[PDB]
């Protein structure tokens, strides 16, 4: 008689566990779909006298952060408008590096490529015109 | 039961009932902040999620128009 | 007995999930195909006395917008016919920059290159004759 | 009952592995963006009496090295200012070849083309005026 | 009573097997990452009188071997510095083909392209100047 | 006792199914490799008086067919040597269009570009000299 009791107990436990796994899979779907996709929608302007990056970013996911910046050699901090809203927006970020100060002064008018290290593990490649 | 756009989850207010077969549904979404946020994405692609009553989430791709 | 129940539950869940993924992939196809492709089909005219750009644009995709303009140094707003219908059309856009006013007055008759920053993340390179 | 346990074990392992791969891909992005781009921004001067190359180089990436030089026939070593900082800078490199000594003495005033072999796998083509 | 005994036996077997599979997957990751990446970081020199290839190779993976060479028509053996250490290094490889002897003697000064067949399944394309 | 029976039944069924899938994948490999690659290996001659295309085609795959032709405006049928053997061969195809008759008569000596729509879904771009 114990055999059928064990059979039912195991059947119901397996059903509960399978439903848990399926719910987890669909939660993973919904979470990865809306994780946050940040890209560039136009050229940036890198003021070399003040070292200020004005960039237009498009974010069609969750509201992420800007944790770091990667310029030619050094990775520097950021000190302005770190919060990336959703949609398309123009952000004005003040970059802080030790050595790059006055290094760009000899590049006014030329193009440059930066990287933005976001909080959600994504890195964004940015193109900019160096100005003064 | 619900919709999931870039940041926020919002209610739906139309044709919530999914009949069987293939059908074209016109769902009115309601979020507080996303109002006028998509106005700068006209023409671009976007990805949404639909939270159904049977525990299944459906991933949808959409073109943003105006 | 529970093993086969679990097996069928997982099989059906996997079928549902795979169908969801395939539908999403084909939706992505159809969405990226008709996202909006804007190009130039003839030289533009940049009136320097009024700073007005008359340009013929071809758009074989979705109806986009014109968010910004990029002239030699500055990025400026636009204040006319920002909506790009489908097909080939002649648009008359009034550009607004602070300093470029009366700067092109010494370029009448010469060629120039502008950029149009569209709402769908695309930038269009435009060539124009500067007139007055 | 074991089926669903195995299913969740594999699901979580797959999520971990996929996240690892995605992080690696974005790291590759960030690394290749700032790998180091060196070009020339003005004519060089090749002193043929002392065989010294004075060249103005622009480097908008990581700080690379100058490992070799390639003049008409021979590849020779360099013995000065091997380190290329970031930005635009004027470098005075002392080249050393066995045979080219006194060979350029018959080219004073004419043009010549060199190659620079950098540490980051990139070769830079340089143009120079031979002087004395 | 046997049902639950079988259930636990199968559960522990499944956990052991899944852990084996996951460990094997991560080992595959670590192994394919450091398998050996060999490329060229500067033009090679192909001495046509002695038929000797002086080439600068960059290898950022495991220490591979040079098993064969592929010149214009024929694949030939190699007889020197077959072992590719890690890093950037200058290798002097003596090639041996029966027919190509004295064939390059009419190509001095021109450019040529060779292939190196490595031990780790990778073929490396090399560009060289033919000298004498 | 039923649990282990179920486990082995599912194990053998899964092994059979996995082997079926792997066999199908390798069949897909072998089938896509030898599908038929048709290209041009020399200029074609388009006789405008008789409207006859003499073209040398190279096909290193399966023996495909020529289902249609695409000339400047119209898509026309073919009425000769529709079968493409393997190897390099010179084919003489009689094209049939309603309007193009006597239209090429004003292009004798000039170059033109055609398209061949093959049976295997591949289109081949051809260049031809218009003759008479």
Author numbering:
A (entry chain K), C (entry chain E), D (entry chain C), E (entry chain I), F (entry chain G): 1 to 132
B (entry chain S): 67 to 132
Give passages from the manuscript.
We present in this paper the structure of two additional archaeal T4P, one from Pyrobaculum arsenaticum, a neutrophilic hyperthermophile (optimal growth at 90 °C, pH 7) and the other from Saccharolobus solfataricus, an acidophilic hyperthermophile (optimal growth at 75–80 °C, pH 2-3). Although the full spectrum of functions played by archaeal T4P is yet to be uncovered, they are known to mediate adhesion to various biotic and abiotic surfaces, and play an important role in DNA exchange, intercellular communication and biofilm formation. Finally, we show that Pyrobaculum and the Saccharolobus T4P are at the forefront of virus-host interaction and are recognized by two different viruses, likely serving as primary receptors during virus infection. We show that whereas the N-terminal domain is conserved in all bacterial and archaeal T4P-like filaments, the C-terminal domain of bacterial T4P is unrelated to the immunoglobulin (Ig)-like domain shared by archaeal T4P and archaeal flagella.
The S. solfataricus pilus was very similar to that of S. islandicus, albeit at considerably higher resolution (3.4 versus 4.1 Å), which was not surprising given the ~81% sequence identity between the two. While multiple helical symmetries appeared to be possible based upon analysis of power spectra from these filaments, in each case only one helical symmetry led to a reconstruction with clearly interpretable secondary structure. This was a rise of ~5.3 Å and a rotation of ~101.7° for the P. arsenaticum filaments and a rise of ~5.0 Å and a rotation of ~104.6° for the S. solfataricus filaments. The small difference in helical twist between the two resulted in 7-start long-pitch helices that were left-handed for P. arsenaticum and right-handed for S. solfataricus. However, in P. arsenaticum pilus, there are slightly more than 3.5 subunits per turn, so there are 7.1 subunits in two turns, while in S. solfataricus there are slightly less than 3.5 subunits per turn, yielding 6.9 subunits in two turns. In the S. solfataricus pilin, similar to S. islandicus, only about 1.5% of the residues are charged. In S. solfataricus and S. islandicus, ~37% of the residues in the globular domain are either serine or threonine, potential sites for O-linked glycosylation. In S. solfataricus, we see clear extra density consistent with glycosylation on seven residues, all serines or threonines. There was no apparent glycosylation of this virus, and the small extra density not explained by the atomic model involves a few disordered C-terminal residues of the capsid protein that were not part of the atomic model. It can be seen that, as expected, the S. solfataricus filament has a significantly greater amount of peripheral density due to glycosylation than the P. arsenaticum filament. Whereas binding of SSRV1 to S. solfataricus pili is likely to be mediated through carbohydrate moieties, direct interaction with the pilin subunits might play an important role in the case of PFV2.
